[PDB]
Design a protein around this ligand. Structure first.
Ligand SMILES: CC[C@H](C)[C@H](NC(=O)[C@H]1CCCCN1C)C(=O)N[C@H](C[C@@H](OC(C)=O)c1nc(C(=O)N[C@@H](CC2CCCCC2)C[C@H](C)C(=O)O)cs1)C(C)C
Ligand SMILES: Nc1nc2c(ncn2[C@@H]2O[C@H](COP(=O)(O)OP(=O)(O)OP(=O)(O)O)[C@@H](O)[C@H]2O)c(=O)[nH]1
Ligand SMILES: Nc1ncnc2c1ncn2[C@@H]1O[C@H](COP(=O)(O)OP(=O)(O)CP(=O)(O)O)[C@@H](O)[C@H]1O
Ligand SMILES: Nc1nc2c(ncn2[C@@H]2O[C@H](COP(=O)(O)OP(=O)(O)O)[C@@H](O)[C@H]2O)c(=O)[nH]1
Ligand SMILES: [Ca+2]
Ligand SMILES: [Mg+2]
Lengths: 424, 440, 338
């Protein structure tokens, strides 16, 4: 089989991680004890991608739960699917992050890192054919951002020809008051652009704006934001989890989606947006700015590559027609120099609550709007050196902030370069 | 004797293989267990069907076939499917991890780990042959295994078998069913690497087969199963010369003599008729003249291109079923009286014809009407070059920016291999231009 | 010596073009009814296209595309956008519009209008501006000829300081070969009196015509902001560029409009050739989404830009066909494969 190893780090990582496992367990017919009581053989055909098969015909998530605070991992065990996890895959610290990247990456997280690697090793070593790794984390905190990216670097050393995939939640002042997060994000992006193959950009800015404006929620909660994150996560992993022809494993996806190694930051989308349609409507909503999980307008750049997944019982002829339709009518927004760069998959099994849905994965040059926003907030407080001593204290030079700032702006220039390029 | 060994590489090669063998077994009266009641020589023989099937002492007729894929899923369905007893387990070869739509993985990284094993199993089939003719290699252009592994294998077969014949059935990519943006790269790379090692290659445009299924069989959104059942019929028509004997049968090697004027110009255009649904075939005989004229309609071609804007260098017709010389001769004389077809000035305006009396078969629960008589035309037209030009343009669009090139470089390839592969293709397009210019 | 005839004296743009042609020394102006011309700078109304291209030994060229009126009349534009599958009825960049004759799609308008009343959402429309249906239909039966009811953009992008509305004029030259050339200089035609959510009587803050603006001229000379200054505003205040935030959408809209009518108006295999200068009018909303308002078939230029544009027209539209004895245009072309 082609197995993926899941890792969830920090508060955000473990939250969205837990909900990911709730949702896909529902889809695959797995209850919290880990027994199959589903109605279809298509649920089990590729169960080994995410689940280990234990004794007594039971299924255990190949998941590794990590945090420097021991508190957040108590709440995971207490959770509805908490009992299903492997008890010795819980690796917890003492101090906590303090929303300090350096603590996560160089000091406190460094002390804990070998303990996580021991568990990763034991999962990896008993895989028939390991695809690679999937990490859920935020970039604004200290553990998920700093230790999560250390984890990434350390797993590459030992599995250098395996695919490294992250779900990386971006900070927004609209969601968290912590003034330091622009540093944590910039230092994390510095890592991700070098050491991941594919990164889904989950932008809290976008998740808040969808909840406030479109869903008409006056005081959106982390649970409201994560309803969107989990639907996105179910959608983008559908091709990996069910039998299919297109993007069926992590490397094939990467080869379809990443034309240049550094440009591996995707902009997911979803239709219909809900809180707790026809193919032409799903197809129009998918490419419209409102439905993007990154606060970027795709009309402000060009798509390098696109994956579109349609879920439900619908006409495959109608999807083909609408997907041609949307490309003709939006031709300028697709780079002319990568022919046939939009791929389409149709999975008959719909997600829970919806009779048909659509998931979008775009590699757009418009993603630069996200990185420029972070870069403005970073450079607001880095010119005046606000709160540098938090990081200098842990041993970091000031030069590493300059290098990381510069690499993130190099990335911006690069997106712009391929946005402006023609076939001539 | 004159044994042929079939090699099916990657998902496309393998799935088309299944459809071909299933169809062969139906045509010869061979059961899914390999038993063939009509064959009175148990244990062996030199009947025409023995070019493609060996025999065991227990009366089992075993395909002279290897199925190779770098990943077990597709071949696992052959191992457990309707025809699992037909094949010895050693003919079905799989690795663990596929080439991820990357020629470089198929040729070098993953491919090298299984290549000696594949040659081993091929050698075992070869050593059961009294007079091995050659090989038929089925593969996609687009896939990493189909492109990269097939190339490596063709290179290795030239070394281990000298100038023993190698024929390809190559699946040319179409956007309606493609699964990879880099398929143009894989196509150019494999065509460059394979060109010196192949004697004759039949390209099958998935878009062409897709359109025939939509237009002629009224299939709304054709699947691989739809495409493969039609592809099977065309392959069967071509190999029918080898698998059946008959007084008017012309061997595939005789057609090749006419089809290949220069070593590099070895890509014949196939056209098949009639493709018709059961509902339309009811109360409708298509005569010899009718199916023959249908060979000159571009809508029936296996590759999208226009031979009315090119020139012919050869034209072969492979009839099967209730077809007699008088009707063929009259039908073809009309065609040349009518013109519509121009030969290059260095090629005589002949038509090489074969007839096998055994009529076409269809697989149960399929889309094709069972008809009394079918024809496959194999022509050598300058027009086939259109297919190279369409792929070469897509290649250039991406390669000018080096898009996706790092995936190939990361597995060991150099940019030199891309530009070298592309120049060879530019040379091939020029060759097809040059053969069609009039003589001085 | 090439020859031309001038048949619209009111055109500021082609008065300058004739001036530049005469100054070359290799063009001679003829009298308007002398048919032995190479170039016709034609009249706006009833231009005799049927008489063109029937003069042996003369290659003939005209500065209008016959049938380009379908893009440039408000009622025709709506109909073109509604009936052409390339643009469709679900076009994202053209405000929801309906053609309305006086004493037709008034029945279809009222249905979509009275859906928005129940929906509890912005329900302002334009002919001129009002939120109740009664005042609009009554204004048209009373006003005169065929009219268009179009969705009024509730939430425009507003310049600061001053909280002002604006529209963007882009000049586009389509030559005889059907190359689409966007002039690199466009212009923002600004309102000077601050924008108001409730005050629809006063139609100086709501309508941004260079004439109807008459305070005035405070923030910029003649209420004309150009692209260097507007790019800087976008960089400073919004952390984005003109090119990225607005100009990609403008390029797309122009190229889509002109490609849609190309079969109906191209002069590729015709006995005479056409070029034409168009003026596209765009509206930017607060999300930085661009919307097309109208296309003008006989646009005027802004005073500062006349000399450069008109010399461009000569270089790429006229001297391409009639050769004599640094490029101000962006050529709009895109061939995505699918
Ligand atoms: C008083 C400060 C308030 C709480 C804060 N606002 C700000 O920080 C403002 C302050 C002005 C400057 C701008 N910022 C954004 C605020 O509204 N924060 C929210 C998060 C806040 O609501 C919280 N949400 C939850 C929450 O999601 N609890 C859910 C369960 C989990 C509890 C454990 C953590 C994950 C969520 C249960 C709820 C009922 C649900 O499922 O909807 C716990 S605390 C974010 C999403 C904007
Ligand atoms: N006609 C036909 N085409 C197929 C079939 N399966 C795949 N293809 C085409 O083959 C190309 C993809 O290559 P595959 O053969 O699936 O790839 P592979 O050779 O298995 O290589 P990897 O999967 O990269 O190891 C695309 O152009 C598909 O449209 C099939 O059963 N029939
Ligand atoms: N849907 C809409 N939303 C917002 N503003 C609009 C609008 N339609 C028109 N306007 C405003 O009205 C102004 C002029 O309207 P428009 O350009 O449609 O007619 P026009 O310029 O052809 C008038 P005339 O034909 O008398 O010269 C625009 O510059 C714009 O500011
Ligand atoms: N969408 C979402 N964002 C979260 C969640 N939890 C924390 N965050 C965000 O994550 C950042 C803080 O990181 P956190 O995970 O709390 O830090 P760590 O646990 O020390 O790694 C802030 O930008 C929060 O807005 C969550 O459950 N959902
Ligand atoms: Ca026998
Ligand atoms: Mg494969």
């Amino acid at each position: 089989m082609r197995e993926i190893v899941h890792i969830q780090a920090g508060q955000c990582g473990n939250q969205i991680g837990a909900k990911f496992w709730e949702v896909i367990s529902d889809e695959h017919g797995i209850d919290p004890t880990g027994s199959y009581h589903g109605d279809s053989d298509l649920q089990l055909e590729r169960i080994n991608v995410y689940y280990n098969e234990a004794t007594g015909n039971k299924y255990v998530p190949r998941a590794i739960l990590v945090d420097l605070e021991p508190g957040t991992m108590d709440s995971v065990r207490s959770g509805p699917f908490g009992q299903i996890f492997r008890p010795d895959n819980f690796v917890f610290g003492q101090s906590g992050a303090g929303n300090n990247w350096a603590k996560g990456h160089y000091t406190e997280g460094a002390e804990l890192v070998d303990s996580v690697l021991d568990v990763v090793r034991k999962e990896s070593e008993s895989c028939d054919c390991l695809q690679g790794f999937q990490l859920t984390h935020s970039l604004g905190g200290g553990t998920g951002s700093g230790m999560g990216t250390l984890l990434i670097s350390k797993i590459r050393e030992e599995y250098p020809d395996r695919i490294m995939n992250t779900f990386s939640v971006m900070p927004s002042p609209k969601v968290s008051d912590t003034v330091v997060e622009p540093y944590n994000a910039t230092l994390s992006v510095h890592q991700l652009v070098e050491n991941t193959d594919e990164t889904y950009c989950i932008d809290n800015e976008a998740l808040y704006d969808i909840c406030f404006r479109t869903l008409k929620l006056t005081t959106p909660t982390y649970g409201d934001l994560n309803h969107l994150v989990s639907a996105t996560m179910s959608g983008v992993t559908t091709c990996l989890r069910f039998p299919g022809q297109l993007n069926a494993d992590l490397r094939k996806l990467a080869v379809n989606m990443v034309p240049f190694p550094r440009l591996h930051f995707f902009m997911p989308g979803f239709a219909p947006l809900t809180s707790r349609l026809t193919v032409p409507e799903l197809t129009q909503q998918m490419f419209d700015s409102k439905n993007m999980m990154a606060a970027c307008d795709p009309r402000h750049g060009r798509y390098l590559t696109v994956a579109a997944i349609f879920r439900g019982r619908m006409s495959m002829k109608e999807v083909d027609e609408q997907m041609l339709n949307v490309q003709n009518k939006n031709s300028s927004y697709f780079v002319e120099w990568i022919p046939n760069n939009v791929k389409t998959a149709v999975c008959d099994i719909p997600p829970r609550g919806l009779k048909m849905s659509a998931t979008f994965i775009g590699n757009s040059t418009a993603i630069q709007e996200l990185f420029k926003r972070i870069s403005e907030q970073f450079t607001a407080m880095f010119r005046r050196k606000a709160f540098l001593h938090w990081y200098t204290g842990e041993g970091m030079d000031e030069m590493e902030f300059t290098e990381a700032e510069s690499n993130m702006n190099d990335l911006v220039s690069e997106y712009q370069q391929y946005q402006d390029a023609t076939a001539d | 004797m004159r044994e042929c060994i079939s090699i099916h590489v990657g998902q496309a090669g393998v799935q088309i293989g299944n459809a071909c063998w299933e169809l062969y077994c139906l045509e010869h009266g061979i059961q899914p267990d390999g038993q063939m009641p009509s064959d009175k020589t148990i244990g062996g023989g030199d009947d025409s069907f023995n070019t493609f099937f060996s025999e065991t002492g227990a009366g089992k007729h075993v395909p002279r076939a290897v199925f190779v894929d770098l990943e077990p899923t597709v071949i696992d369905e052959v191992r457990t499917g309707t025809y699992r007893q037909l094949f010895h387990p050693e003919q079905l070869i799989t690795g663990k991890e596929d080439a991820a739509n990357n020629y470089a993985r198929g040729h070098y990284t993953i491919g090298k780990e299984i290549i000696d094993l594949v040659l081993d199993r091929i050698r075992k089939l070869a050593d059961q042959c009294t007079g091995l003719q050659g090989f038929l290699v089925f593969h996609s252009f687009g896939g990493g295994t189909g492109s990269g592994f097939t190339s490596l294998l063709m290179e290795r077969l030239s070394v281990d078998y000298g100038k023993k014949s190698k024929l390809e059935f190559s699946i040319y990519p179409a956007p309606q069913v493609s699964t990879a943006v880099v398929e143009p790269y894989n196509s150019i790379l494999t065509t460059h690497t394979t060109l010196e090692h192949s004697d004759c290659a039949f390209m099958v445009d998935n878009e062409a087969i897709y359109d025939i299924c939509r237009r002629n069989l009224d299939i709304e959104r054709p699947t691989y199963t739809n495409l493969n059942r039609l592809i099977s019929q065309i392959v069967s028509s071509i190999t029918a010369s080898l698998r059946f004997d008959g007084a008017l049968n012309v061997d595939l090697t005789e057609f090749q003599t006419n089809l290949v004027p220069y070593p590099r110009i070895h890509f014949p255009l196939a056209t098949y008729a009639p493709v018709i649904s059961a509902e339309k075939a009811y109360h409708e005989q298509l005569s010899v003249a009718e199916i023959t004229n249908a060979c000159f309609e571009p809508a029936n071609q296996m590759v999208k291109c226009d031979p009315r804007h090119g020139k012919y260098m050869a034209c072969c017709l492979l009839y099967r079923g209730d077809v007699v010389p008088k009707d063929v001769n009259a039908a073809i004389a009309t065609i040349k009286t009518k013109r519509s077809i121009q030969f290059v000035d260095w090629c005589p305006t002949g038509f090489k014809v074969g007839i096998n009396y055994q009529p076409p078969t269809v697989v149960p629960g399929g889309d094709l009407a069972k008809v009394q008589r079918a024809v496959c035309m194999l022509s050598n037209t300058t027009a086939i070059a259109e297919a190279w030009a369409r792929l070469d343009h897509k290649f250039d669009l991406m390669y000018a920016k080096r898009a996706f090139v790092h995936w190939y470089v990361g597995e060991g390839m150099e940019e030199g291999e891309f530009s070298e592969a592309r120049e060879d293709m530019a040379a091939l397009e020029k060759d097809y231009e040059e053969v069609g210019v009039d003589s001085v | 010596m090439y020859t031309f005839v001038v048949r619209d004296e009111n055109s500021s743009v082609y008065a300058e073009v004739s001036r530049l042609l005469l100054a070359t020394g290799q063009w001679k102006r003829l009298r308007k009814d002398n048919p032995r011309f190479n170039l016709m700078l034609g009249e706006r109304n009833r231009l005799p296209f049927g008489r063109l291209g029937h003069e042996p030994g003369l290659v003939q060229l005209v500065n209008y595309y016959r049938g380009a009126d379908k893009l440039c009349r408000k009622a025709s534009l709506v109909k073109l956008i509604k009936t052409s599958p390339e643009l469709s009825e679900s076009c994202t960049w053209f405000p929801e519009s309906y053609v309305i004759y006086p004493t037709d799609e008034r029945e279809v308008f009222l249905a979509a209008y009275n859906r928005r009343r129940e929906g509890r959402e912005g329900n302002v429309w334009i002919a001129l501006i009002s939120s109740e249906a009664s005042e609009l239909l009554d204004f048209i039966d009373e006003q005169g000829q065929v009219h268009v009811i179009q969705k009024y953009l509730e939430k425009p992008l507003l310049l600061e300081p001053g909280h002002r509305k604006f529209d963007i004029r882009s000049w586009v030259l389509v030559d005889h070969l059907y190359n689409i050339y966007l002039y690199r200089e466009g212009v923002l035609r600004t309102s000077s009196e601050p924008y108001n959510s409730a005050n629809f009587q006063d139609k100086t803050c709501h309508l941004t015509n260079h004439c109807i603006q008459k305070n005035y001229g405070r923030y910029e000379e003649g209420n004309e902001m150009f692209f260097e200054e507007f790019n800087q505003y976008l960089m400073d205040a919004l952390n984005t560029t003109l090119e990225n935030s607005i100009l990609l959408q403008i390029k797309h809209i122009i190229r889509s409009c002109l490609m849609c009518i190309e079969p109906a108006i191209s002069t590729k295999h015709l006995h005479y050739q056409s070029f034409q200068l168009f003026g596209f009018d765009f509206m930017v909303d607060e999300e930085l989404k661009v919307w097309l308002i109208e296309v003008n078939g006989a646009p005027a230029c802004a005073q500062k830009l006349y000399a450069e544009l008109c010399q461009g027209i000569v270089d790429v539209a006229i001297s391409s066909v009639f050769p004599l004895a640094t490029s101000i245009f962006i050529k709009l072309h895109h061939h995505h494969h699918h």
